[PDB]
Ligand binder design. Sequence first.
Ligand SMILES: O=C(NO)N[C@@H](Cc1ccccc1)C(=O)O
Ligand SMILES: O=C(NO)N[C@@H](Cc1ccccc1)C(=O)O
Ligand SMILES: [Zn+2]
Ligand SMILES: [Zn+2]
Lengths: 158, 159
Amino acid sequence: SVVLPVAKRGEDILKLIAAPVSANELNSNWLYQLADAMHATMLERNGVGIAAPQVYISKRVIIVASRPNPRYPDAPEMNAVVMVNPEILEFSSEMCLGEEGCLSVPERGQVERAEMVKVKYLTLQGEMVETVFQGFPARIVQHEVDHLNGILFVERIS
Amino acid sequence: SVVLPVAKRGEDILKLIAAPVSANELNSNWLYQLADAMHATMLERNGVGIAAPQVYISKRVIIVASRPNPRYPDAPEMNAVVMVNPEILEFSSEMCLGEEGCLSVPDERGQVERAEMVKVKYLTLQGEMVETVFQGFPARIVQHEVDHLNGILFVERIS
Ligand SMILES: O=C(NO)N[C@@H](Cc1ccccc1)C(=O)O
Ligand SMILES: O=C(NO)N[C@@H](Cc1ccccc1)C(=O)O
Ligand SMILES: [Zn+2]
Ligand SMILES: [Zn+2]
């Protein structure tokens, strides 16, 4: 097992548009290990999500993993989901405000997000999934996709 | 073994300074798998070297692997060397000029002046320190790959 260094605000890797994962990488040891290192890194830093660019990997892979922990004591439980090449298909016009932080901005803020999102993605095995999130998990999906598109949560404030 | 997508000139991932590999990564299955995918990619594309930023991984890992192949039919053959956190500690004042291509630059080769000899200190995948002297075409490969780690493409070194 490994815990990967996390890039911080100011580093240009967080400003890129991450590249999609290729068909060759689906169901590979390489991809399972990337996802495992990400997962371990998120857990060690009490994150509730992580995106590959945060660990210097400019690829479209995120994890969404709400759980109560010291950084988010009230966060709801979910089974962690690894999403390859996620795309938000629909954002609700209805919005919610919530406090976010970021492993890459060690500073928190209050951000407006869609209350609901519908997201398409591939599993690590290559299966195409479409699914709806609400509330805090929806916020995490939006924050992590933003990371894939070179956007930090501070740029969504004001 | 997986063959990975390769970034091309224009893509901003190739302009960054790649981050050093951290101590906890040394001798990790993570780092072994990265190197294996790099190596497979390089062989599948007939490269004689590869840098992690070329496969969208902004970390300081390179492979130097001169061998004759369809892209470089007269290259000398060496045993492939994977280098973690390579640092060039000496460049010779003597220069050689040679035609270089790049996995990241399609449809172009150019004449590039390189030091004829470089001394490079690096870590193995297990994390052991090694210092090696390279000459000639292997030396040009080391220099090209270290330039990839520093956000530089060979086109920026011409004339
Ligand atoms: O930086 C990351 N993700 O990029 N981790 C965030 C995820 C997050 C997203 C939205 C709201 C709250 C929290 C964190 O502080 O755990
Ligand atoms: O683009 C890469 N490496 O980044 N590979 C180059 C390596 C290289 C370096 C120097 C001289 C000739 C060839 C290639 O065309 O195989
Ligand atoms: Zn974040
Ligand atoms: Zn190159």
